[PDB]
Amino acid sequence: EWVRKADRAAGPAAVLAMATANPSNFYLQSDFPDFYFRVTRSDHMSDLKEKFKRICKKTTVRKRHMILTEEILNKNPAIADYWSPSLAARHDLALANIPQLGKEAADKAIKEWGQPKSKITHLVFCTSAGVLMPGADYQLTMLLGLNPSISRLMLHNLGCYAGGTALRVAKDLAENNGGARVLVVCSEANLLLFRGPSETHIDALITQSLFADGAAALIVGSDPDLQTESPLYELISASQRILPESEDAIVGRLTEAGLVPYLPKDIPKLVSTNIRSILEDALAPTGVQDWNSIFWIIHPGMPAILDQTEKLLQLDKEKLKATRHVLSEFGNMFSATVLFILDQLRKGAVAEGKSTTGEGCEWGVLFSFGPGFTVETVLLRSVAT
Amino acid sequence: EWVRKADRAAGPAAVLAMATANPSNFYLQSDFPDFYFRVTRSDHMSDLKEKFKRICKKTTVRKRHMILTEEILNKNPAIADYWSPSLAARHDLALANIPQLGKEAADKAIKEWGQPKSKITHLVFCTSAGVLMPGADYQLTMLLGLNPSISRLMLHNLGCYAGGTALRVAKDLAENNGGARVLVVCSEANLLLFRGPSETHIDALITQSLFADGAAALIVGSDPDLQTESPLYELISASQRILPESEDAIVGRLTEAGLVPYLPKDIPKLVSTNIRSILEDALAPTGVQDWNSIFWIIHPGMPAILDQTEKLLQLDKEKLKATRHVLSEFGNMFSATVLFILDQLRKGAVAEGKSTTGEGCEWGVLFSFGPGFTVETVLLRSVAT
């Protein structure tokens, strides 16, 4: 059967451009335990400091960009405490930083795209760094001078899987509207999660060792004008799933003192149980049986999950190379991390000179996760260089 | 030109079912000034009490359903104060009430729809009553036993226009995925906005006179199986717009003490300036020139906007009848209000026995608004009874 094309697009949604951005201020992981326990007026917790040093080393992270400088933490002491009233201050910082960080990634992705920004018809904006009314989607539209009639989808506090959610949303936006060009932006920061240590809570210390700040921006569109636009990936399928027996695995309570996490269940064992059949379902219409015949993007929120998954699928160590790079160089930047990894993968493919944007392979899987327990899964097709 | 139907849907998204729900506990508007100033330990502000009485009367509201009982306000005194740390308590109440309220509307819309809930493939969930991780979208999926692989879009704290946003999102979900059935749920409550009075702030007293609690649920799908499903409306176009010269018209700061509004600009004059050309743009592909040849749903967040708009377009008073009913009987239920009004309009058409679900008229416009200043506009086509 056939249908009249009408106002709709012919082909699959394509990633047409991608860039990233980070705050200027970063911290090397090897200096962070000293910086963290100094500025949170907490050097006295000497045994906890030792525990944190051990955790920070095992995160295999090297640096993390962070809006929060010593000076800003000085001008907002409540944020540095473990649990003091501080939501308005965190959100004042989100308003001064999150749309601006998004605009820096967006400007670079639009520059690569090479088209006028009045051709952008949709914005998808994800952040867990501050609930704003009007949203960071609004602030970015103003800072960028986008059409006032852009169709915006503002996604607050989905958590870490929202990079997948952004692609899943952009897919239906682009395919159902002919000509539609979708700016996708995930702009993340620890502004809600950052706090001092307490011996009573260690599910808060692990969070201080990993989360960092960054924004990714993409252009997503179908029916590319192949003489002005160069597709980078195709978004072929995009699905969401609640994993069985995962109730309250990841919970985030937003309080007077900001965002407070609670991690009772074994996240690795949950992923390890379920990842294979999820990915088998994603790969089903490709006829790919070899796990190392596809490129890989896994949200790196827990390093152990990468290792255990690498082992289970007996992946070549080179597969998770883009993923492990972003982890080491940037940390967990919430929903943005998987889009950084997509970008590093595209860049490492062109640098090392391989046949496809997907490292020579044809198909690829994007796998992200967070509260639910929720998994987002995207099936990607590379393009030839 | 034509395209292969493939995995996509042939025709426009249709509203196939709708129901509403409210908390059991309600308050008549004529008793509210006494109840409000009593339970907020505030009877001493006698002049403010008089001012509130005047505001409450001019809201033309008759009753409002509210989760917040005297007893619950007794068990959470910080919520009753003007500005005390209370976010965690408000959010504990959101978790116990907002997904459940959504489930009551959903159960009734699914019952009308007449299909098994395993046919539901997408959930769009809007709320400004509490940021939850995982979201009310998750909690509802569990309470309803929906497929764990449903595609969910959780929209926190868009504010009052999100009933339009929900329809705009559901439209592209249904049209781009053949067979897709989209549960749409807006579940709203004043849990973040409720607070005591202060003489220093009157842009907070007006908010206490209008906002109320309620949930609406719809089934949205394209390609209806016309022997098991009876379409109610078609979603023909859906657009969003930032109005010019509207920077900071409506701002909502989420703080330690909950959601605090700020309303510096003249909202009526902004709508009055712009509504005509927006609606003319929506109606453009219909060839309708008569304003009273179409049915009407206007978000009733400010009663004066209804009157001034009724006058400007010289509308027959009968046009905004469904809209004014919901206002009087339920108040401003945030994003849910325009879906209540859609439902009351459908019900008033079948009750008074008219030719179309749109009161005999063929086309209709849905107009909602909130922070930005943002306007959502949906073009609806009725169906014959």
Author numbering:
A (entry chain A), B (entry chain A): 7 to 391
Give me lines lifted from the publication on this model.
In this work, we demonstrated that PECs in agarwood are biosynthesized from a common precursor featuring a C6–C5–C6 skeleton produced by a diarylpentanoid-producing polyketide synthase, hereafter named 2-(2-phenylethyl)chromone precursor synthase (PECPS). The last remaining candidate gene encodes a PKS (PECPS) sharing high amino acid sequence identity with the other four PKSs, as well as the highest 93% similarity with AsCHS1, and this gene maintains the Cys-His-Asn catalytic triad conserved in all known type III PKSs. The crystal structure of PECPS showed typical homodimeric type III PKS folding. Crystal structure analyses suggested that PECPS utilizes unique one-pot catalytic machinery that includes the release of a diketide-CoA intermediate, which has never been reported in other known type III PKSs.
